[PDB]
Amino acid sequence: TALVCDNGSGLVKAGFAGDDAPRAVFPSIVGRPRHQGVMVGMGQKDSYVGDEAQSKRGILTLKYPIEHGIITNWDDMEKIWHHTFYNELRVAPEEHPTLLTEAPLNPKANREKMTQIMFETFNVPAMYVAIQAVLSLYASGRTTGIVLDSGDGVTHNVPIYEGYALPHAIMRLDLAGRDLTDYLMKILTERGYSFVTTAEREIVRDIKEKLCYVALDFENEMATAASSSSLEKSYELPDGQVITIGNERFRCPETLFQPSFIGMESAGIHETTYNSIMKCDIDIRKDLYANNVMSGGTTMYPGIADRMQKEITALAPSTMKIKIIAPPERKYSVWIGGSILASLSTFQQMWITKQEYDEAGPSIVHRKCF
Amino acid sequence: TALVCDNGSGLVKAGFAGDDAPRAVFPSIVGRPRHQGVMVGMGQKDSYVGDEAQSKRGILTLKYPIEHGIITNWDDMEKIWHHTFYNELRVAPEEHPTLLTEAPLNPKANREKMTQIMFETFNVPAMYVAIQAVLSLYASGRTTGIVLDSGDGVTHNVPIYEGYALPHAIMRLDLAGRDLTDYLMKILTERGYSFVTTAEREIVRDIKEKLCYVALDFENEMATAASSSSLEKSYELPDGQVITIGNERFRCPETLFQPSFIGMESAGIHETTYNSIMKCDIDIRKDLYANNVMSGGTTMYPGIADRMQKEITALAPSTMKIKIIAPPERKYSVWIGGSILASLSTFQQMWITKQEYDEAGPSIVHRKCF
Amino acid sequence: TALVCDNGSGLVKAGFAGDDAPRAVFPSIVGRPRHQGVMVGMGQKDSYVGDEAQSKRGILTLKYPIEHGIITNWDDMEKIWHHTFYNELRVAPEEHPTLLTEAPLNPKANREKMTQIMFETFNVPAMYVAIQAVLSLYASGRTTGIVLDSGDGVTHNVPIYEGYALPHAIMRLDLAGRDLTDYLMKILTERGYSFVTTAEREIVRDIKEKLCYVALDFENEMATAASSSSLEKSYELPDGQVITIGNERFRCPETLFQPSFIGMESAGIHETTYNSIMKCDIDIRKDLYANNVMSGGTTMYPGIADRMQKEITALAPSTMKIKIIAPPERKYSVWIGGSILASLSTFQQMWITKQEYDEAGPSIVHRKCF
Amino acid sequence: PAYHSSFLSLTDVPTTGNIAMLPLKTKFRGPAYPADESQMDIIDECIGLFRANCFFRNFEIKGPADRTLIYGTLFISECLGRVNGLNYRDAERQLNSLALENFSIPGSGFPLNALYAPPLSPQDAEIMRTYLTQFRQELAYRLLSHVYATEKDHPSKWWTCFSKRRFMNKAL
Ligand SMILES: Nc1ncnc2c1ncn2[C@@H]1O[C@H](COP(=O)(O)OP(=O)(O)O)[C@@H](O)[C@H]1O
Ligand SMILES: Nc1ncnc2c1ncn2[C@@H]1O[C@H](COP(=O)(O)OP(=O)(O)O)[C@@H](O)[C@H]1O
Ligand SMILES: Nc1ncnc2c1ncn2[C@@H]1O[C@H](COP(=O)(O)OP(=O)(O)O)[C@@H](O)[C@H]1O
Ligand code: BEF
Ligand code: BEF
Ligand code: BEF
Ligand SMILES: [Mg+2]
Ligand SMILES: [Mg+2]
Ligand SMILES: [Mg+2]
């Protein structure tokens, strides 16, 4: 067995290769206390990690060590990996290879320090660093398609044909569920309700995860919510009081299809997918159009597969069929795909091994993992 | 063995660390004789303290040395500390490290002179000052909750969550047993009974201690007392004459809920407790409404927990559960909490020793204690 | 001619367009009596407003009808506007269009209820609701800048370039002159002075305005105040007694740079400025750092512009000038800006007219104003 | 061969579970009998051996003095795990708090529960806890005199780098 540790920017998703689904899913958060620690003894800790922080958050400054899929704070990222292996999986990491992941078009130094900490702190016996939108394509049961992965921090497209990636046609967009959370705070502020702190940012994430949905036709949905009760509904806070919301429920997800709302100049996710298909060689485009693959938690909004199929069918030539593949387990497909990969018998030849790291130094990942 | 001295506004409570209740409780009072004293030499003395002063009250001027939790006369206060050590506990203070209690939001000069007298005059080995609210959580055996403490001189709230106090959400209210005794000593004049002397203050206190109760619905108790004698009670004064009391018997404690009765603007104990919860972070409020810890001798009127639970249920959102926690030992729960704190094996490195007072003066107390 | 009326959380500031300074500058207060009122013919009235409430305060509870730039008490807010027009300005509102003000990121029910009161009750010919900061830039005689505005109830940044605002880089912080006043009421307790009534909040506000100043280097000013010296200064209360304060003079406004003094988990005004600039498009940052504009009464502490220049220079990259403009008229520069904007010969197309409100209802205010 | 305790040659020393309550030089309150102030008691041995014994990976236990030395050798690794970046004035207080916080005794959560005999009675558990708290308070205080030997505001890296090392791959 080998660990598969998809340290995403919003959730760590971890477990064992060939296991059905990730067994350690928790916030990619380190919390530190912000108040007068008056009661002596009491089992107090200098910092808290994951669900241990999320449940204590009313006294903590929660901060994610990872932003837009790039590690910003290594002293806390080691704290998350240590929590993953010793507290959440309860293994010794020196006994198991780890398949890690990262998004494409990351800094070189991210990939180096992430191999160095696995070999020099966690003492791991072998490791590998897969591209997240390649893994999501194993989890679809395919060898050609265009994975749209979108998580908490990054959205990216990787077009693949016959198992060859077309790396010139990879699109990264630094917009995903954390920007939709920050935008939901900016529009909730307009109805009556103020959310400000790093802990209140989790309450509005827990709104976004169950009140929001994607409108199939935003400009007509906007007129319908401005003229009826049916689109409005309510959520009950930790403080027992009720929050009622309406056109905020679909204006939030719409930022993915209209990044101009949060001040970005870019294509939306629909036109970013088409700009990746139209960068590919002309003979493969039909087999990409019939195999768009949704992945990552930001693709979980009710109606996003219907909307994505509508917007791509308007951009694509009407002569040919579009399919969006969106399984119900697309919430974890990058982990699911790493759990396939780390169990394929040729894969056991591809690991960076401890001995090979010791001899080659941390630059070995650049001449073995892609 | 350490001493715990809850040096309160109306009662001193004192005992050793790890005792289950105070070994001494007595009036926090010093007095001088009010008359010519012509028959000299039958054991008269220049001044009287504690139970001796209380026993001779009719021939005495009685001075409390503490006003609203601030020492207002230092000679009278060090006479009480001298009397605790050399009459009530009968121990060398220079062999017993001492734990002391204070209200939050207090003059820094009070804690300094209280420190100075302990090292300069009682020569104590080591000493500590605790904000008396958080001792009520030690006595209640809990890491979490909102204290309401009402003493003789001060009423104050402190939210604590999982061992951390919220020092911005703390608040205090200079209204408790003394001001209720002043108000009762006023309103008995509406029935034509009269009390004015520093001795008669204690007679009205001794009436307030047993006749008075908290109305669950003040307008109903007013309307019923205005139309029946069945709520009336009677009591006999030391001089031999007798009094009968009606609506005055609950209109007095109602001042805790309506401070405008004594001309104060700031709100009652229910409203200030709710505002102290609402001043906390949004997530912790669920656990604070479930842990309203009552404390201090003014929180002991019949019906006060039932009234407090009714009042806060009208303020808080009804889709959550609010409870008042009010043990039979309420009156001593500050001292009981100090006895627990002074017993903790982890606390024994927090006593401020004379061997770090010497090179720092009284000023050390603000950085070493709290 | 046009009226201009800044609905300040602490002072109403009102006048005609093209006047050089506001005609009316008075507290945003409604006062009510709290005493028996036995004196027939005392000149007493059922409620008090502005400077009549401020001068009569000894017998009153004082109610601010705005909290944090949001109207919390509409029935008393239309009493303030009625007092403003009919008593303070002595105008018929039917003869003058009104420019009103609102802070950014504000519950849009506030904006609707405000315009509804102007058209339904004051019958104002036409009106507008400017963003509170965009007026401040006009008064500076400027078109590129980052406006740091801070009043009695709200502090916010609007970065704006060539007359285009960046609405995604607008940042708001509900910390201002009242939060500093209430923190001063808290820390004045450490000397043993006490202030608790709403009338005493005004006395602490009157201390704050002339005793407090911003330390250039807070820890070094604390270490300088640790020896009694020219740091401490006297003030004389309405009671005729003197008080003295030391480092309470600069712990007072240091809360702007350290909101954790009032328990807020948010950046100070220096990092809120720098985070607003670092959210802006990379080319405009140089011109925003060169054109930072302060406004509102909380920007008037001695040394605050100097210490801001020092703090932004420590955050920003070191190659380039940083210039925080602090006008001497910045006490009123939002109203000065409104007096310019309502006077421009290009602006008369932008007023909401009574005739189009009578078609559209109050929702026209969003479609016209932002 | 790893380095065993000198005290395994000693006999008729008191015992709890099958720890040895070896003679101790200390100021802390507890049941350990006073050592000669001029002699290496088990804590000077345990600190002297720790930096060598945590590199070996095969350690036969001869008796109750080695069961005591192993608990010390494991608790040194907890202290060096704590101490990184502290001032000595903070490290004293942090490592006394570590020494005094509630811990599992052998026979209760304990890692080496296969090799240490549970307390013989409900009373034997208390004499064991009051010994092990006195032992590990003194062990923390003694260790700090070595790790902050030459400079008082930065733990010497020649001691701090064993914080990743882990006696026989066990820890508390
Ligand atoms: N049901 C849902 N509806 C909308 N957003 C969701 C849903 N479930 C998860 N998310 C969002 O997905 C993000 C986490 O997705 P994930 O794929 O695990 O991201 P990452 O890999 O970067 O950690 C968070 O922003 C979360 O709120
Ligand atoms: N059973 C009681 N019910 C109501 N008031 C009481 C009762 N017993 C004592 N008191 C009041 O308790 C107050 C003393 O409370 P305490 O906590 O000891 O105050 P302190 O600590 O500040 O001296 C006195 O004012 C006294 O009148
Ligand atoms: N000289 C000053 N120094 C510091 N603070 C001041 C000064 N003058 C006024 N203030 C404070 O600024 C606030 C009023 O500012 P203002 O711009 O009028 O706010 P608002 O527009 O929101 O009503 C009050 O808290 C007031 O006490
Ligand atoms: F880091 Be997640 F994939 F956005
Ligand atoms: F001093 Be008591 F708490 F009023
Ligand atoms: F409302 Be003021 F601008 F704080
Ligand atoms: Mg991801
Ligand atoms: Mg008390
Ligand atoms: Mg203002």
The answer to whether A149 and A123 are in contact (CB under 8 A) is no
Query: Rounded distance, CA A256 to CA A180, Å?
Result: 8
Q: Residue C176: exposed, middle, or buried by beta-carbon count in 10 A (0-12, 13-18, 19+)?
A: buried
Q: Are strands C324-325 and C292-295 parallel, antiparallel or unpaired?
A: parallel
Q: Token pair for residue B168?
A: 């911005």
Q: Residues with Cβ < 8 Å from D55, sequence gap 6 or more?
A: D165
Count of other CB atoms within 10 angstroms of residue C218: 16
DSSP annotation of D123: T
Helix, strand, or coil (residue D24): strand
Q: State the smallest CA–CA distance between residue B345 and chain D in angstroms.
A: 7
The answer to whether A14 and A84 are in contact (CB under 8 A) is yes
DSSP annotation of D108: -
Q: Residues with Cβ < 8 Å from B190, sequence gap 6 or more?
A: B248
Cα(C187) to centroid of ligand 8, in Å?
A: 22
Cα(C342) to centroid of ligand 9, in Å?
A: 18
Token look-up 């958050």 returns A57
Query: Rounded distance, CA C176 to CA C261, Å?
Result: 13
Query: Rounded distance, CA B75 to CA B79, Å?
Result: 6
Task: Provide the residue type at A189 as one letter.
Answer: T
Count of other CB atoms within 10 angstroms of residue D7: 21
Q: Which helix (H) or strand (E) holds D19?
A: strand D19-20
Query: Rounded distance, CA C161 to CA C144, Å?
Result: 4
Cα C335–Cα C340–Cα C345 angle in degrees, nearest 5: 150
The answer to whether A208 and A193 are in contact (CB under 8 A) is no
Q: Which helix (H) or strand (E) holds D130?
A: helix D124-147
Query: Rounded distance, CA D6 to CA D62, Å?
Result: 11
Q: Taking CA atoms, what residue in A is nearest to C173?
A: A196
Which residues make beta-bridge pairs with B156? B149, B172
DSSP annotation of D8: G
Q: Token pair for residue B211?
A: 């006749």
Token look-up 């052998």 returns D106
Q: Which of B164, B280, B285 sits opposite A33 (nearest CB)?
A: B164
Q: Which of C105, C109, C172 sits opposite A192 (nearest CB)?
A: C109
Cα(B177) to centroid of ligand 8, in Å?
A: 10
Q: Which of A44, A197, A240 sits opposite B319 (nearest CB)?
A: A240
Q: Residue C328: exposed, middle, or buried by beta-carbon count in 10 A (0-12, 13-18, 19+)?
A: exposed
Picking from C194, C244, C248 by the largest number of B CB atoms within 10 A of its own CB, the best residue to mutate is C194
Cα(C62) to centroid of ligand 6, in Å?
A: 18
CA distances from residue A294 to A64, A171, B166 in whole angstroms, order as listed: 25, 14, 45
Chain B hits for D96, CB-CB cut-off 8 Å, are: 349
Query: Rounded distance, CA C279 to CA C166, Å?
Result: 9
Q: Residue D27: exposed, middle, or buried by beta-carbon count in 10 A (0-12, 13-18, 19+)?
A: exposed
Q: State the smallest CA–CA distance between residue A207 and chain C in angstroms.
A: 19
Closest by CA to B237, choosing from B278, B205, B263, is: B205
The answer to whether D86 and D155 are in contact (CB under 8 A) is yes
The answer to whether C190 and C249 are in contact (CB under 8 A) is no
Q: Are strands B60-63 and A292-295 parallel, antiparallel or unpaired?
A: unpaired
Q: Taking CA atoms, what residue in A is nearest to C110?
A: A192
Answer yes or no: CATH 3.30.420.40 is held by domain A134-180+270-332.
Answer: yes
SS3 labels along chain A? CCEEEEECCCEEEEEECCCCCCCEEEECCEEEECCECCCCCCCCCCCEECHHHHCCHHHEEEECCEECCEECCHHHHHHHHHHHHHHHCCCCHHHCCEEEEECCCCCHHHHHHHHHHHHHCCCCCEEEEEEHHHHHHHCCCCCCEEEEEECCCCEEEEEEECCEECHHHCEEECCCHHHHHHHHHHHHHHHCCCCCCCCHHHHHHHHHHHHCCCCCCHHHHHHHHCCCCCCCEEEECCCCCEEEECCHHHHHHHCCCCHHHHCCCCCCHHHHHHHHHCCCCCCCHHHHHCCEEEECHHHHCCCHHHHHHHHHHHHCCCCCCCCEECCHHHHCHHHHHHHHHCCCCCHHHCCEEHHHHHHHCHHHHHHCCC
| Interface residue A201 vs chain B (CB under 8 A) | no
Query: Rounded distance, CA C364 to CA C358, Å?
Result: 10
The CB of B176 under 6 Å from ligand 5? The reply is yes
CATH (residue range A1-26+68-133+333-366): 3.30.420.40
Query: Rounded distance, CA B295 to CA B51, Å?
Result: 24
Which technique?
cryo-EM
Q: Token pair for residue B125?
A: 């080995």
Query: Rounded distance, CA B83 to CA B90, Å?
Result: 9
| Interface residue B109 vs chain C (CB under 8 A) | yes
The answer to whether A197 and C265 are in contact (CB under 8 A) is yes
CA distances from residue C132 to A22, C20, C148 in whole angstroms, order as listed: 50, 18, 11
The answer to whether D50 and D166 are in contact (CB under 8 A) is no
| Interface residue A196 vs chain B (CB under 8 A) | no
Query: Rounded distance, CA A61 to CA A48, Å?
Result: 10
Q: Residues with Cβ < 8 Å from A308, sequence gap 6 or more?
A: A148, A269, A270, A273, A292, A294, A324
Query: Rounded distance, CA B269 to CA B274, Å?
Result: 9
C98-102, strands of its sheet edge to edge: C24-27, C11-16, C3-7, C98-102, C126-131, C352-353
Q: Is residue D69 part of a domain?
A: yes
Task: Using the atom order of ligand 5, give the atom closest to the CA of residue B153.
Answer: 4
Within 13 Å of residue B81, how many CA atoms lie on the same side as its CB? 28
Task: Provide the residue type at A265 as one letter.
Answer: E
Report which bound ligand comes closest to the CA of C66: 6
Helix, strand, or coil (residue D61): coil
The answer to whether B29 and B66 are in contact (CB under 8 A) is no
Sequence length of chain C is 370
Chain A hits for B318, CB-CB cut-off 8 Å, are: 240
CA dihedral D135, D139, D142, D144 (to 10 degrees): -150
Residues of chain C with CATH 3.90.640.10: 181-269
Query: Rounded distance, CA B281 to CA C205, Å?
Result: 26
CA distances from residue C224 to B127, B140, C230, C231 in whole angstroms, order as listed: 29, 43, 10, 8
Count of other CB atoms within 10 angstroms of residue B145: 21
Query: Rounded distance, CA B304 to CA B288, Å?
Result: 19
Q: Token pair for residue B51?
A: 């139970």
Query: Rounded distance, CA C356 to CA A121, Å?
Result: 69
Query: Rounded distance, CA B312 to CA A91, Å?
Result: 49
DSSP annotation of D117: P
Which residues make beta-bridge pairs with B67? B70
Query: Rounded distance, CA B284 to CA B342, Å?
Result: 28
Answer yes or no: CATH 2.60.40.420 is held by domain C27-67.
Answer: no
Q: Residues with Cβ < 8 Å from A316, sequence gap 6 or more?
A: A274, A277, A289, A322
Cα(A317) to centroid of ligand 8, in Å?
A: 81
Query: Rounded distance, CA D140 to CA B69, Å?
Result: 41
The answer to whether C155 and C68 are in contact (CB under 8 A) is no
Query: Rounded distance, CA D45 to CA D28, Å?
Result: 19
DSSP annotation of D150: S
Phi and psi for A204 in degrees, rounded to 5? -70, -30
Within 13 Å of residue A291, how many CA atoms lie on the same side as its CB? 21
CATH (residue range A181-269): 3.90.640.10
Q: Are strands A145-150 and A292-295 parallel, antiparallel or unpaired?
A: parallel
Q: The CATH number of the domain where D118 resides is what?
A: 6.10.20.160
Q: Residues with Cβ < 8 Å from A55, sequence gap 6 or more?
A: none
Q: Token pair for residue B23?
A: 């070994």
Ligand 5 pocket mutation, candidates B5, B64, B152, B300, criterion most atoms within 8 A of CB: B152
Ligand 2 pocket mutation, candidates B149, B203, B331, criterion most atoms within 8 A of CB: B331
Helix, strand, or coil (residue D146): helix
The answer to whether B180 and B208 are in contact (CB under 8 A) is yes
SS3 labels along chain B? CCEEEEECCCEEEEEECCCCCCCEEEECCEEEECCCCCCCCCCCCCCEEHHHHHHCHHHEEEECCEECCEECCHHHHHHHHHHHHHHHCCCCHHHCCEEEEECCCCCHHHHHHHHHHHHHCCCCCEEEEEECHHHHHHHHCCCCEEEEEECCCCEEEEEEECCEECCCCCEEECCCHHHHHHHHHHHHHHHCCCCCCCCHHHHHHHHHCCCCCCCCCHHHHHHHHCCCCCCCEEEECCCCCEEEECCHHHHCHHHHCCHHHHCCCCCCHHHHHHHHHHCCCCCCHHHHHCCEEEECHHHHCCCHHHHHHHHHHHHCCCCCCCCEECCCCHHHHHHHHHHHHHHCCCHHHCCEEHHHHCCCHHHHHHHHCC
Task: Provide the residue type at C86 as one letter.
Answer: Y
Helix, strand, or coil (residue D168): helix
Query: Rounded distance, CA A111 to CA A103, Å?
Result: 10
CA distances from residue C81 to B278, C16, C18, C47, C98 in whole angstroms, order as listed: 30, 15, 21, 14, 11
Q: Token pair for residue B86?
A: 């050399």
Sequence length of chain A is 370
Dihedral sign for Cα B288, B292, B293, B295, please. positive
Q: Are strands B11-16 and B242-245 parallel, antiparallel or unpaired?
A: unpaired
DSSP annotation of D33: P
The answer to whether A151 and A297 are in contact (CB under 8 A) is yes
The CB of C298 under 6 Å from ligand 3? The reply is yes
CA distances from residue A136 to A295, A307, A324 in whole angstroms, order as listed: 7, 21, 14
Count of other CB atoms within 10 angstroms of residue B305: 19
Which residues make beta-bridge pairs with C155? C150, C173
Task: Provide the residue type at B79 as one letter.
Answer: K
Dihedral sign for Cα B249, B253, B257, B258, please. positive
Query: Rounded distance, CA C152 to CA C138, Å?
Result: 21
Q: Token pair for residue C171?
A: 């940042």
The answer to whether B248 and B191 are in contact (CB under 8 A) is yes
SS3 labels along chain C? CCEEEEECCCEEEEEECCCCCCCEEEECCEEEECCCCCCCCCCCCCCEEHHHHHHHHHHEEEECCEECCEECCHHHHHHHHHHHHHHHHCCCHHHCCEEEEECCCCCHHHHHHHHHHHHHCCCCCEEEEEEHHHHHHHHCCCCCEEEEEECCCCEEEEEEECCEECCCCCEEECCCHHHHHHHHHHHHHHHCCCCCCHHHHHHHHHHHHHHCCCCCCHHHHHHHHCCCCCCCEEEECCCCCEEEECCHHHHHHHCCCCHHHHCCCCCCHHHHHHHHHCCCCCCCHHHHHHCEEEECHHHCCCCHHHHHHHHHHHHCCCCCCCCEECCCCCCCHHHHHHHHHCCCCCCCCCCEEHHHHHHHCCCHHHHHHC
- Resolution (angstroms) stands at 3.2
The CB of B88 under 6 Å from ligand 2? The reply is no
Query: Rounded distance, CA A218 to CA A301, Å?
Result: 14
Helix, strand, or coil (residue D15): strand
Closest by CA to B221, choosing from B250, B259, B245, is: B250
Residues of chain B with CATH 3.30.420.40: 1-26+68-133+333-366, 134-180+270-332
What is the greatest pairwise CA distance in chain A? Answer: 73
Helix, strand, or coil (residue D170): coil
Q: Which of C107, C265, C279 sits opposite A197 (nearest CB)?
A: C265
Chain B hits for C197, CB-CB cut-off 8 Å, are: 265-266
Q: Are strands B98-102 and B233-236 parallel, antiparallel or unpaired?
A: unpaired
Long-range contacts (CB closer than 8 Å, 24 or more residues apart) made by C225-228: C225/C250
Query: Rounded distance, CA D12 to CA D5, Å?
Result: 16
Cα(B117) to centroid of ligand 7, in Å?
A: 63
